[PDB]
């Protein structure tokens, strides 16, 4: 649980980890923390994944029915007000602290929202609980107007800071760039590689024991 | 407000006897809660030549339950003139650690040496003064992961017991193959890890380099 | 005691090729008020060796007294330069004190760093406590501690306690190199106190950077200026 | 957070730092605590983050209803034509000015948009707001609403946040009747800075808000506090 | 847990599992329970692992000087004596151990269920665990007293399986020793996957039940 | 607190409970007690737990499965009357608690002689023999070593006894009196067994 | 997830072939078995098996549920509903019960069915595993390989993690998921008295019981 | 939860308790328990409460009155015995519990037959009938509405067996087998007693 | 309660309100808070009022008893002759001044009589303290005890008490670095009033000590505060 976001010149640039734990354990090393909210619009979050996995999918599909009715692409401040009503309702249970960034008739425009569903406007920002070591490394090298090149690399920086300095963030990162046109979603982009690589060996045929077997045919 | 004076530093500690040998293997990061402190802190000192203890639970106390047991040993060895055997050691681990049964170090403990001509022995302890005799033994937070390991390959449910012998080479490798599973799939174990083999003659500290995340 | 009301705040000890450079802000709050913004938190416990702070100030002001009669002490039964405490035994001392607290449950509510030069091949067999050129230092004649209150100690390159230890360590673990020269560490430790600065409530300017060389001990107050990031546009 | 407002000889200053933390952590610098409810008034919220942010939600909607509500149906004023620094001293003072619809017919009193607060926060809620912008009545005016939801028209200054205790006796001294523009922007800047200098929960730049009878001028201040002494 | 006792025709079967689990885990499956207190005393572990342990291995250490002052072998009844007042001065400590000392002394064959709160009782089928309930189901129902050692130590065998069987903290290996008139053997130092073999002998399903 | 043991066979299904009436904890109340709730279906019902909430939810599951045999000329399926029963346990289990330990038993034309156990918690399952209360831990091993395939009527009955002398002889609180219902050969047989 | 009821369940993906297992165990209390039967694997649909673990009256609660809404679904269209549908039906169900949830831990295993040509004279083509795993407020983890839930997490984690190799057939991927079951319900005192083990291909479907240590 | 009754008489002393074993209270332990400590000197002390608290403290008195006896060539009387043992029971009553219900009985040359009530908390008082355990509320109306001046000894067992009978049919825990012991005749005779 | 010091060109000054408060009721009104530990130096107390005074107590009898013990044996100085307002203002200003036993060479130093409270509070005692007095050595002289006996040397000026945080920036504003006996006097007066204005722990009257290298002058004002605006 290590996500990020910036501002640069003309797009924004969202950044996250792959991981999910039980607490103590890993569940698995490769789950999409970003979101697609609409084409020009990206969302990344922490906090339980349960609710902050409906959520998404309940704002991205609002959006969606939202900008059929209206005939403009959605707009990012129309997100924000959505989900923060969403999360003042429920007073702080549905803890999900959601990056939200993406690109409208205004400039990129990058939200961090909160569980108790407060929000702001941010140049660059980084929650989950890794955000502390992803934020230094962030403030460190943050400039203005930073090229889409070489913002991008910088939440490479960003994200590996908190992938090796926290705990509870790790695995591969991902990237999606919000320009105007498109998006840029890269799955994997990072997490280096030669460890002790276990050596397969499975077990032969005649194992177990299967005291019954009732094989059938199905058509 | 209350200070609950325990915290777990995490890490794993893997033992594993074989006929003439025992092979203790440990990470060495010492990690807060979700922070890290150190990348490499030492959860393995030696006691004599032939017998070696392993900890992993809060590195406060492991510090000083080590440093406890080598003073203890040291004291033994110049009352008595002659190094303790690892059952001797055992016994006494059993005693210190059952001293403060009501305030009780947060430490597990696996104690492994020889004590025949050969005779790889190991012993496992659960932070309160009791010790059994193991074929394999691991604790800490890989201790849920690890155990069912060590038991597919050690032990069997197999229906035909494949791999009867097992050469200290082949153990050395099975130990690397667990400790980095346990890397992979915990969040406290450790980057880089010691792996001690306790053969006839002496000691290795052979070290083993894992995933950082 | 019971609660650290008067806490300090994060300080960063890294060796550099010269010795070791730790720093550390003047600023004791009182909760969420900045009641002191004088008060010094890195102390000189030996001609050698220098004491961090965090938490608690009564607690820690009651450790400095104990490891200043400690030094007297050694100083009174010092017959030669080799004598005198390494860092490494205030070290093993500081820790044995914080876990003895911790069998009883008055931990003293700390993150004692301990710093400092682990020989005598610099002499120093001329001592005032009460008041050249540097040399190079092999870097593993160089200790630093670090003491959890829980009696946690290890030793490391660059031991950053308190709140620094989330900002300022990352920063070292992807740029401390060895051998740095002085003015490259202070830039670097610059670098790490300027973000706690925007990034840290408790925290302030007005640095007391310390170092440890051949010679000694030494001192000073910058006003490290942070100004970054064109927040202000409206 | 702290929060000020100062009434002065023709308007009303409201300044505010900006740094919301969150247990001794700060979540982000820069964080907007001036906030436009009309063209005529703003909003200075602190307390809970989230309860604030809610509430001004709420009474924008509010405004907006009642300010077209209260749009009276013909032309009016047909040939009425009644109208009318500081000088990056303080280093890095960002600026901007914008001007009214004025006449005051459509946009509504500051006095109105302050009791939505009582009657939405007379609740189990959390946020002190400050309330100052020009009227066409009560010419500029600022009311203080409490924890519960307990207004009271302040005359001459109102202050708010965790560190409004620290400058409570330093803002009474300096305080005049009838100050000047100059004046008051200064005194509004040295208390909004002493505030920070002496609390943790000091903001980065303050944003300072003056409403006067025909424009809003909006300031941010990037700038520290050296005693000597 | 499990643990047994018989006191039957010519000997106590005292009989238990091998099964050490934390919590919800298995943290060992080859423990050993019952302790050589004595040539002719041995004593059983149940409860906190490390609380009856040390206190039995304690207690041998107290008989052996008292066996040896004296040079005439401790009973059971004194020794039971002996363990249950050291075990009172941890009331309040959180101790747990049920110990149950069966031996052969002067006076017969004695056995002693002892309890972590100094609980010293007489008895001739005594059990203690947390399947103990179904360890002394099965016994009341097949218990004679007039067994012979064949079929005492089959019926030791048979509730300590149905003890494991339902309880799910009771397995692993079954031990089933035997007391003599002088000294005591290691009838069964055995195996627990033996579910098919007492019922549903054939493995052909599932064992409905 | 009171014992219900339930036992299936090929051709029979015996359900056994005490007659006590725990009420008064400090003491007993009636000395035949009344648990069981016949279905008209060749069903039954046997409940555990507090006795207040024994009649409200017993009877209610009756009502109700004689209506649906009623409204319907059918006779209702012990599978359904099975699954009927835990779904208004658990239907009501976060709402009201109904500490109550079902043995649900019945005969089918379809699928023969079933018993089914379930628990406060609406944990229903089909089982080859069941036990509930506090005298489960002390019945269930009688009910394993002496039971097995294809038993008679007249063996069962011997286990069951085997059982009660049990819980006479090592149960906390002594029940000797116990009431048995054998279903067998379309028969629903009531006899009362003591000691 | 509970003690009480303890049980575990485990999906395993092959070449061209997934499995399924579970252990039989219904546990009244943590430590006290009362049944061996109970099968914690359901038949959704001809290729859509899901796994429920943990307390047995969430376990079977939902299962009515998700077989009332997917018989409705598949009825109401004439066509053979399909896992990624049904998954993410699942995470919807457990989700409107956030704030009295369902005590489960579903396991989701079952073939993709593309839906290409396969042929110039050919219709519907080869299938995909589609592993996945949630918990009891329904997050979809997702995973390309073997899946677990139950008290056994932890305990199958470290085992399929070991074991676990890329590609297998019917028989290979049998045996592993057999041995990452067996060996993970013997260190484990609160489940595993039985182990039913599912393997199915696009053609058959096997069901295995294994010899499994009941302890 | 176990049942101690006295009676007294002007020349008897009857003492009745169950014979049980409760602990492992899911359970009981032993049919045959022993609570009776017969002191030398014609004097009895029936304890109730915990098992292990009985051992302890009946144990310690049996001691200290023994040694009392030995370096005094007297026999302790009965009230000494009865003060001294609620002495020791309130001495550790603020230091530890001993849940331990007393029932002091004896023989004395000077104040014949006396019986003593004590409570956990120490609450000694000379009674001419008494009960402990939750038993006492159902068997002290019987020691009243039968009980009469200057009774027999065979009368006194028949109303033991009045009460005995009592806790069978209405009592929670059914308990069967009791122990007696009669203080009469400058003897202390013992007989169990079932059902 | 509230408790300044200052310390000026000459000499140290402390000031306190005198009010014992007990739940919104004063338990009494004129309770003294500057306590005489020794003729060059004083203490003003805070905190909970049964341990503030059970300390000074303590110290005092440390005091007195490291008084006579550093008492040097024969007799000094023998040629030696070393030596050296406000009128009613202020309305109601008592007033009396007492002179020393000059050279310093019995009374013991300040930063001595200030570890005794480390020394001695160092535990689950809740009182802070400010000690201010002359010295030998260091001339005048402010050590500010905290809630757990963390003692700092203040060089300028050091505040406690409830009421300290309403003039914290007050105080900080109006210090210079050398202020006269006069700017000191009307400084700490002003302050202590200001921070009695708009505090419920606001004293009656308020006592002012001064410590000088020759005497010490001790003032009682009676006076309230009245802001025009
Ligand atoms: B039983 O399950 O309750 C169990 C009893 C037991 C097991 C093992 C040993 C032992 C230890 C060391 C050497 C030899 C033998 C003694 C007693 N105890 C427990 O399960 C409890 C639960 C959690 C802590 N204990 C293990």
Same mark, same amino acid.
């Given at each position: 649980?290590? %996500? ?8 924004? %640039? ?206 | ?57 809060? #590195? ?83 201790? #849920?992961?690890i155990l069912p390991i060590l038991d597919n390959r050690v032990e069997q449910k197999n229906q035909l017991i494949k791999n009867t012998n097992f050469n200290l080479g082949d153990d050395i490798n099975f130990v690397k193959d667990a400790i980095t599973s346990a890397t992979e799939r915990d969040i406290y174990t450790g980057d ?22 | ?234 | ?229 | ?83 249950? &007042? ?23 064959? &004695? ?12 008895? &001739? ?22 067994? &012979? ?12 399986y149905h003890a494991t069987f339902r309880d799910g903290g009771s397995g692993g290996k079954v031990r089933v020793f035997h007391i003599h008139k002088n000294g005591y053997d290691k009838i069964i130092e055995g195996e627990d996957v033996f579910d098919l073999h007492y019922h549903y002998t054939n493995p052909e399903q599932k064992?409905?039940? | ?195 | ?21 579970? +252990? ?5 209390? $943590? ?113 390309? +390989? ?5 008290? $056994? ?22 045996? $592993? ?8 319900? +013997? ?29």
């Amino acid at each position: 649980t290590t %996500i990020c976001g910036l501002v640069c010149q003309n797009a924004v %640039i969202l950044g996250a980890d792959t991981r999910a734990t039980e607490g103590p354990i890993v569940a698995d090393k490769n789950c999409s923390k970003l979101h697609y909210i609409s084409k020009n619009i990206w969302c990344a979050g922490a906090g339980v994944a349960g609710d902050l996995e409906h959520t998404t999918l309940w704002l991205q599909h609002n959006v969606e029915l939202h900008r059929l009715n209206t005939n403009t692409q959605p707009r990012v401040s129309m997100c924000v007000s959505r989900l923060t009503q969403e999360l003042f309702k429920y007073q702080g249970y549905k803890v999900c602290a959601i990056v939200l960034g993406g690109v409208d008739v205004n400039g990129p425009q990058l939200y961090g929202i909160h569980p108790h569903g407060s929000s702001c406007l941010l140049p660059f920002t980084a929650l989950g609980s890794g955000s502390l070591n992803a934020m230094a490394v962030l403030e460190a090298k943050y400039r203005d107007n930073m090229t889409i090149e070489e913002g991008k690399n910088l939440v490479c920086e960003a994200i590996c800071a908190g992938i090796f300095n926290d705990l509870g963030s790790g695995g591969n990162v991902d990237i999606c760039v919000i320009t105007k046109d498109s998006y840029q979603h890269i799955r994997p982009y990072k997490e280096p590689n030669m460890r002790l690589y276990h050596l397969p060996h499975p077990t032969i045929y005649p194992k177990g024991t299967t005291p019954i077997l009732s094989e059938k045919i199905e058509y | 407000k209350r200070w609950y004076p325990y915290i777990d530093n995490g890490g794993t500690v893997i033992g594993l006897t074989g006929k003439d040998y025992v092979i203790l293997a440990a990470d060495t990061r010492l990690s807060l809660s979700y922070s890290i402190y150190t990348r490499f802190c030492p959860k393995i000192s030696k006691l004599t030549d032939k017998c070696i203890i392993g900890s992993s639970g809060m #590195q406060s106390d492991i510090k000083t339950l080590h440093s406890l047991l080598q003073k203890k040993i040291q004291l033994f060895v110049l009352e008595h003139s002659h190094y303790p055997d690892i059952h001797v050691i055992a016994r006494l681990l059993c005693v210190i650690l059952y001293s403060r049964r009501f305030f009780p170090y947060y430490a597990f403990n696996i104690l492994a040496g020889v004590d025949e001509n050969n005779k790889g022995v190991l012993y496992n302890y659960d932070s309160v003064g009791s010790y059994c005799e193991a074929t394999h033994s691991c604790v800490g937070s890989g201790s #849920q992961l690890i155990l069912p390991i060590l038991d597919n390959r050690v032990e069997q449910k197999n229906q035909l017991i494949k791999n009867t012998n097992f050469n200290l080479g082949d153990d050395i490798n099975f130990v690397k193959d667990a400790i980095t599973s346990a890397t992979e799939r915990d969040i406290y174990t450790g980057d880089k890890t010691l792996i001690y083999v306790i053969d006839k003659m002496g000691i290795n500290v052979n070290t083993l380099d894992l995933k950082q995340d | 005691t019971l609660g650290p009301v008067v806490t300090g705040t994060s300080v960063i000890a890294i060796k550099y090729k010269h010795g070791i450079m730790i720093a550390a802000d003047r600023k004791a709050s009182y909760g969420s008020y900045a009641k002191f913004q004088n008060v010094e938190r890195i102390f000189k416990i030996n001609n050698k060796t220098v004491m961090g702070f965090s938490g608690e100030l009564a607690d820690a002001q009651y450790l400095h007294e104990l490891l200043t009669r400690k030094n007297i002490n050694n100083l009174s039964e010092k017959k030669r330069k080799e004598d005198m405490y390494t860092p490494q035994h205030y070290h093993s001392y500081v820790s044995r004190v914080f876990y003895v607290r911790k069998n009883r449950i008055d931990p003293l509510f700390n993150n004692i760093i301990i710093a400092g030069i682990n020989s005598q091949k610099y002499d120093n067999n001329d001592d005032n406590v009460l008041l050249e050129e540097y040399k190079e230092i092999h870097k593993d004649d160089l200790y630093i501690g670090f003491v959890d209150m829980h009696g946690t100690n290890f030793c490391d390159d660059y031991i950053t306690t308190g709140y620094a230890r989330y900002f300022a360590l990352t920063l070292l673990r992807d740029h401390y190199k060895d051998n740095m020269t002085e003015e490259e560490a202070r830039i670097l430790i610059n670098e790490c106190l300027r973000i706690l600065y925007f990034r840290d409530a408790t925290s302030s300017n007005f640095i007391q950077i310390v170092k440890v060389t051949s010679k000694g001990v030494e001192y000073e107050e910058p006003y490290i200026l942070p100004c970054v990031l064109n927040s202000a546009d409206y | 957070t702290t929060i000020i407002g100062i009434i002065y000889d023709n308007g009303v200053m409201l300044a505010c730092d900006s740094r919301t933390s969150s247990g001794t952590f700060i979540s982000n610098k820069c964080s907007r605590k001036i906030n436009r409810i009309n063209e005529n008034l703003y909003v200075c919220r602190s307390g809970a983050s989230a309860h604030s942010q809610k509430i001004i939600e709420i009474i924008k909607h509010y405004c907006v209803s009642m300010k077209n509500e209260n749009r009276k149906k013909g032309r009016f004023h047909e040939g009425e034509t009644i109208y009318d620094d500081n000088n990056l001293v303080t280093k890095n003072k960002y600026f901007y000015e914008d001007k009214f619809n004025d006449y005051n017919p459509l946009v509504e009193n500051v006095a109105h948009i302050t009791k939505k607060i009582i009657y939405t926060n007379n609740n189990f809620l959390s946020c002190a707001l400050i309330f100052g912008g020009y009227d066409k009545i009560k010419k500029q005016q600022l009311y203080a609403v409490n924890l519960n939801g307990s207004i009271i028209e302040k005359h001459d200054f109102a202050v708010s946040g965790s560190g409004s205790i620290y400058i409570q006796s330093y803002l009474q001294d300096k305080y005049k009747k009838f100050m000047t523009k100059k004046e008051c922007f200064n005194l509004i800047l040295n208390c909004v800075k002493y505030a920070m200098h002496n609390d943790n929960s000091s903001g980065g730049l303050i944003r300072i808000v003056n409403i006067t009878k025909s424009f809003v001028e909006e300031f941010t201040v990037v700038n520290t506090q050296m005693n000597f002494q | 847990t499990t643990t047994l006792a018989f006191k039957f025709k010519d000997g106590i079967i005292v009989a238990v599992d091998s099964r050490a689990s934390m919590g919800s885990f298995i943290s060992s499956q080859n423990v050993e329970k019952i302790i050589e207190i004595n040539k002719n005393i041995l004593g059983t572990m149940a409860g906190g692992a490390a609380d009856c342990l040390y206190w039995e291995k304690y207690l041998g250490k107290i008989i052996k000087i008292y066996e040896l002052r004296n040079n005439e072998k401790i009973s059971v009844r004194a020794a039971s004596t002996i363990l249950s &007042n050291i075990l009172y001065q941890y009331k309040g400590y959180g101790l747990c151990c049920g110990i149950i000392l069966s031996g052969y002394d002067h006076t017969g064959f &004695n056995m002693f269920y002892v309890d972590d709160s100094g609980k010293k009782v007489e008895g &001739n089928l005594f059990s203690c665990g947390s399947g103990s309930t179904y360890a002394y189901s099965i016994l009341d129902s097949a218990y004679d007293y007039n067994l &012979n050692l064949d079929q005492a130590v089959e019926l030791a065998r048979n509730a300590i399986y149905h003890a494991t069987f339902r309880d799910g903290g009771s397995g692993g290996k079954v031990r089933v020793f035997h007391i003599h008139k002088n000294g005591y053997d290691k009838i069964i130092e055995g195996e627990d996957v033996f579910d098919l073999h007492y019922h549903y002998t054939n493995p052909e399903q599932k064992d409905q039940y | 607190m009171d014992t219900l043991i339930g036992l299936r066979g090929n051709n029979f299904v015996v359900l056994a409970a005490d007659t006590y009436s725990i009420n008064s904890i400090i003491k007993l109340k009636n000395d035949d007690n009344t648990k069981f709730y016949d279905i008209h279906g060749n069903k039954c019902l046997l409940l555990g737990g507090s006795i207040g909430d024994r009649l409200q939810f017993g009877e209610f599951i009756r009502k109700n499965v004689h209506l649906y045999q009623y409204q319907n000329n059918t006779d209702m399926f012990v599978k359904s009357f099975a699954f009927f029963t835990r779904k208004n346990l658990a239907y009501y289990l976060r709402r009201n608690p109904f500490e109550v330990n079902c043995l649900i038993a019945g005969y089918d034309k379809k699928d023969g002689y079933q018993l089914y156990w379930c628990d406060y918690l609406s944990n229903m399952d089909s089982v080859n023999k069941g036990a509930h209360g506090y005298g489960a831990y002390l019945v269930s091993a009688i009910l394993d070593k002496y039971y097995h395939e294809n038993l008679t009527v007249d063996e069962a009955l011997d286990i069951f006894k085997l059982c009660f002398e049990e819980l006479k002889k090592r149960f906390l609180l002594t029940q000797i009196n116990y009431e048995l219902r054998i279903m067998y050969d379309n028969k629903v047989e009531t006899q009362y067994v003591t000691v | 997830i509970y003690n009480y009821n303890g049980g575990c369940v485990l999906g395993m993906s092959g070449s061209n072939c997934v499995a399924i297992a579970c +252990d039989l165990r219904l546990g009244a209390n $943590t430590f006290t078995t009362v049944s061996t039967k109970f099968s914690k694997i359901f038949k959704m649909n001809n290729n859509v098996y899901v796994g429920l673990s943990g307390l047995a009256t969430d376990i079977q609660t939902l299962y009515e549920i998700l077989r009332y809404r997917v018989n409705l679904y598949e009825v109401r269209q004439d066509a053979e509903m399909d896992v990624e549908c049904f998954a993410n039906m699942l995470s919807s169900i457990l989700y409107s019960n956030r704030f009295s949830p369902y005590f489960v831990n579903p396991i989701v295993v079952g073939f993709k069915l593309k839906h290409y040509v396969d042929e110039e004279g050919e219709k519907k083509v080869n299938y995909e595993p589609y592993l996945t795993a949630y918990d009891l407020i329904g997050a979809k983890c997702e995973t390309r +390989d073997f899946v677990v839930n139950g008290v $056994t997490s932890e305990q199958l984690f470290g085992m399929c993690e070991s074991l676990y190799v890329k590609d297998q057939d019917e028989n290979g991927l049998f045996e $592993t998921i057999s041995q990452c079951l067996l060996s993970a319900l +013997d260190r484990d005192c609160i489940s595993g008295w039985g182990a039913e083990v599912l393997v199915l291909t696009p053609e058959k479907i096997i069901k295995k019981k294994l010899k499994a240590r009941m302890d």
